[PDB]
Design a protein around this motif. Structure first.
Motif, mmCIF file in Angstrom:
data_model
loop_
_atom_site.group_PDB
_atom_site.id
_atom_site.type_symbol
_atom_site.label_atom_id
_atom_site.label_comp_id
_atom_site.label_asym_id
_atom_site.label_seq_id
_atom_site.Cartn_x
_atom_site.Cartn_y
_atom_site.Cartn_z
ATOM 1 N N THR A 12 0.807 -1.217 0.000
ATOM 2 C CA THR A 12 0.000 0.000 0.000
ATOM 3 C C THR A 12 0.849 1.282 0.000
ATOM 4 O O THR A 12 1.823 1.387 0.746
ATOM 5 N N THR A 48 0.729 5.892 -1.340
ATOM 6 C CA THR A 48 0.007 7.132 -1.484
ATOM 7 C C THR A 48 0.627 7.888 -2.661
ATOM 8 O O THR A 48 1.577 7.431 -3.299
ATOM 9 N N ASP A 49 0.063 9.055 -2.928
ATOM 10 C CA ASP A 49 0.134 9.813 -4.177
ATOM 11 C C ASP A 49 1.583 10.020 -4.635
ATOM 12 O O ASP A 49 2.006 9.511 -5.671
ATOM 13 N N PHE A 59 3.120 6.687 -5.549
ATOM 14 C CA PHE A 59 2.538 6.079 -6.747
ATOM 15 C C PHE A 59 3.558 6.152 -7.884
ATOM 16 O O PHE A 59 3.980 5.128 -8.413
ATOM 17 N N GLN A 60 4.020 7.371 -8.178
ATOM 18 C CA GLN A 60 5.085 7.685 -9.122
ATOM 19 C C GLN A 60 6.365 6.893 -8.845
ATOM 20 O O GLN A 60 6.870 6.204 -9.732
ATOM 21 N N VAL A 75 -0.527 -1.629 -9.752
ATOM 22 C CA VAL A 75 -1.118 -0.552 -8.981
ATOM 23 C C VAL A 75 -2.597 -0.919 -8.827
ATOM 24 O O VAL A 75 -3.311 -1.080 -9.824
ATOM 25 N N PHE A 85 -6.041 -0.209 -7.714
ATOM 26 C CA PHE A 85 -6.957 0.886 -7.455
ATOM 27 C C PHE A 85 -8.284 0.339 -6.949
ATOM 28 O O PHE A 85 -9.049 -0.279 -7.697
ATOM 29 N N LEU A 95 -4.038 1.114 -3.451
ATOM 30 C CA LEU A 95 -4.424 2.429 -2.947
ATOM 31 C C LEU A 95 -5.889 2.769 -3.211
ATOM 32 O O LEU A 95 -6.510 2.288 -4.162
ATOM 33 N N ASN A 118 -5.161 9.507 -4.700
ATOM 34 C CA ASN A 118 -4.156 9.722 -5.732
ATOM 35 C C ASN A 118 -4.866 10.200 -6.993
ATOM 36 O O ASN A 118 -5.159 9.375 -7.853
ATOM 37 N N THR A 172 -3.980 8.964 -12.198
ATOM 38 C CA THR A 172 -5.318 8.393 -12.099
ATOM 39 C C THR A 172 -6.243 9.120 -13.074
ATOM 40 O O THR A 172 -6.861 8.497 -13.940
#
Length: 105
Positions: free
Chosen positions: A4, A6-7, A10-11, A22, A24, A55, A60, A64
């Protein structure tokens, strides 16, 4: 493997030179509440061949929004920052692992 995120991470996941799944889901989506436990077994089943990086989509908005990711449950498979494939809706394991086989192979 990964877990898990976060934003801003993610990158830093999707940039990696390996299969970054990933995962979602969101805090309300009926079918994603049923796919999330399916995607727990789908984590375990190949747990270190693939990153799985789950996530809550709404947290995010970054990238997205770009890939139309409001269709959750959604599953993008990235590497090098490049999404090689993207799956949506409550696919069973036998369809998911078949479609995704082109990174599990």
């Amino acid at each position: 493997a990964t877990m898990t995120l976060t934003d801003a991470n993610f990158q830093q996941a999707i940039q990696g030179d390996g299969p970054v799944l990933v995962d979602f889901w969101a805090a309300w989506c009926g079918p994603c509440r049923m796919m999330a436990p399916v995607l727990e077994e789908f984590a375990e089943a190949h747990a270190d061949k693939v990153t799985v990086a789950k996530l809550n989509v709404d947290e995010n908005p970054e990238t997205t929004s770009q890939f139309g990711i409001m269709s959750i449950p959604t599953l993008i498979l990235f590497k090098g920052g490049e999404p090689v494939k993207q799956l949506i809706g409550y696919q069973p394991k036998e369809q998911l692992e078949a479609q995704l086989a082109d990174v599990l192979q």
